[PDB]
Design a protein around this ligand. Structure first.
Ligand code: CL
Ligand code: CL
Lengths: 96, 97, 96, 96, 96, 95, 96, 96, 96, 96, 96, 96, 95
């Protein structure tokens, strides 16, 4: 399997969520892995064998899914959430 | 059966909810176990035999379900709750059909 | 039959509702026993013979139902209450 | 007939409504008797012959109905009241 | 006929509406008689021959109807009144 | 012989219904009382009530509600909407 | 043709509108006459031949219509007027 | 033709609109005449030959229409006008 | 053709709009002429040959239309204008 | 063809819009001419050969259209404009 | 083939928008040209060949469209724009 | 084939957006080129071979589309954008 | 095969979002690459072989899609997002 940190660096993930400290690397990495796993299964593209195979648009969707996990931590929320269409669209363009 | 704390450490569960105190470990552990039990039954995947088998997206769902339990303590509330789609979506892609 | 306090201790029930006093254990027990009876009958799973048989997701539902009775003491209220979907979903996956 | 106070003590009734005073024992007793009568007739279970026969979930409904009588004293109100579904779900699970 | 005050004492009627004075006893008695007449006619149970025949749930309905009379004095109001469902439910459970 | 309202409910009780403490409006209050009774009697349309004592307590409750409304709401049109209090008709309806 | 002031005195009309001045007797009389004429035509009862014949509910209606004239002076207004059902209901029960 | 001032004096017209000045007698007279003309035509009753023949309810309608002309001077307004139902009801009761 | 100023003097038009000054007599005369022209064509009554033939209710309408011209200067506005029904009703009773 | 200034002088157009200054005669003239051309074409009555032929109500409509141009300068605006029905109604009665 | 500035001078266009500077003559001229080009094409009248041929209502529309481009500079806005009906009506009156 | 800055100068583009600085020439030029490319493709007119061929209304549309790019920088926004109908209407009259 | 930075420099991308700082260059590069990839696949014009082939209207769309990524960082938001029609219309004109 592909390690998400070989596709998008840990530093870049932290920049996405504007998080400067190094004391949540393990939690952040879990969100990154969850996001990558989600996007890879959704795209379902058996041909991508290595980190360098992942298209830039899929990388953008990974950052959106990841950032959503960092900011929205509960399965139910008090404030209504709205789908940002950009995530599906970045991926749709590369689904099997 | 798989122990949820071998999949996601108690330390990580506490960071999910930004909870620093150590006097609620038993309650927090119960929420973690409940969330894991729920996500496992829902995915219904027999081939996940050990903790290392659990996919990252499923780990993401357990964290969301766990934090919901921690934050929302009553079966009815005065304020409406809205489903966060990420939890079911994280689980759906690892569902045994 | 199963004593709810063998499944979830009274101190956990008190922590669920962040209740620190020692003078409401009898009332709190009555709520806990009601929540457990409700959830047990709803799942209707006779394979749970002893306390250690109760699945973790059902314990979660019992705590939610319990906390509801603690917080919402009247059969009617002036403020509309909304069903928290987590209770039913935690029970559903273990219904007989 | 069963005496409601053999099922849930007067002291527990006063704790439900957080009522500290001792000068309303007759009134409170009347509400308790009314709530029990209502929940009994509703469940319609002739199998329950002694106080000990009353299931925990029915005790919870009796507390909810009792407290509603204590707090909401007129057949009409200037503010709409909303049914708390817990009371009838607690009873439903034991309807004959 | 049954005398309503043999069923629910005047002093209990006064506690229902939290009324302290002894100078509205005639008016309060009229409301109590009207509430009782109302509920007796609605229930239409010929088997209720003496005060002690009246069930607790019906006593509860009588108190609610009585209190509404005490609080809401005019046949039209400038604020909408909403039916409190408890009164009818208390009665329905003993209808003939 | 038409039943007199003041043999059914005293003026004292009419004044307590509206929380009216003064004694300089008995004539006006009597007229409202008589109007309310006339209305409730004709609406119930029960000739079986021959004397004051025949009038059921729930109907006396209705009479007080109708009376109090006349006292408080003096005009055939209002700048604020009025809403019917269901208690009035419900207590007449059962008779 | 009946004189309204034989039915209800000018001073009772003034009490209806809580009007304590003596400088508007002619205007007030006109409103009184208008209200009486209106209610009489509306009921259309040929049996009322003298002031003593006018029933109590019709006097109530006349007072309401009179007061409306006193208070609301224009065939059109800036603020919406709502019909007080009491007026029509008082006359209806004596329509011929 | 009937002179409106023989039916309702100028001073009664001024009391209707609570107007206490003498410098608009000519304009007020015009509104009075317009209101009378309107109501007489609407009623269409040939039998009213002299001032004394005009019924009191119709005089009531003439006052309402007059006051509306006095208060509301433009064929269009920035605020909605609402019809006062009394005007047409007073007239309709004597229509031919 | 009838001169509107022989039907309603310029001084009365000014009082309608509570316009004190004398420096707008030409504009005001123009509004008066337009309103009269409007009302005359709408009524279309050939029998009206002289100023004295114009009925009082038609004069009322003329005053309303005129005042609307003086107050409302633009074919479009940012605030909705609402039709005052009195203008049309006053003309309606004299339409040929 | 008819010059608008032979029908309504510039001084009257300025008074319509309460415009004091004398440095906008050319612009005001353009609005007046645009307004007249519009109203003349809408009415489409070629029997009007000279200024003196133009009916008073049509002059009223010209003033309203003119004033709308002076006050509302753009083909689109951020605030909704509402039609003043007076303009069209005053042209409608002289339409050919 | 017609120059807009021979139809409406730059100085009038500037008065339309109340713009008292000379440092935007080129931009204003461009708006004026675009507005004229738009209205001419829209009316599509070959029979107009010189500046003096263009009717007054069309000059009015040209000024409206022009001013709209001066005030509203973007193809999309955060605030809804509403069509001023005058622009289309001024033009439609002279459509081919 | 045609250079946009041969049609509308950079200086004019800056005046459209009221941008006085000199440090965004490259970005502004990009917006200008994009706007021009879009309008040209939308009209699809092969007869326009050189800068001078571009009609005035089309230049107005280019300015509008340009300014929208300058002001609205993102493919989605927190605030709904409303189409300004002037852009398409300016282009539509020159569409192939 | 075309690198977005050969089409629109990072400097111009920074200007688009009015961002002056020097420490988000790898993040901005990813957004730019993602925006280009998306717009290119959308247009599906394989006749554009080199940087200078890309039409200005497509460059405008790439800037819009880029800036959206920079400003709206989560797959779900608490505020509703509305599509800015300019992005699609600029792309559509070259499909
Ligand atoms: Cl002039
Ligand atoms: Cl670069």
């Amino acid at each position: 399997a592909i390690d998400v940190l070989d596709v998008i660096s840990l530093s870049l993930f932290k920049q996405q969520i504007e998080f400067e400290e190094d004391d949540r690397d393990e939690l952040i990495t879990l969100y990154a892995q969850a996001a990558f796993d989600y996007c890879m299964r959704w795209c379902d593209e058996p041909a991508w064998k290595v980190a360098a195979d992942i298209p830039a648009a899929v990388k953008g969707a990974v950052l959106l899914v990841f950032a959503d996990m960092f900011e929205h931590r509960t399965a139910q929320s008090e404030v209504q959430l709205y789908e940002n269409a950009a995530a599906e669209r970045m991926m749709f363009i590369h689904r099997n």
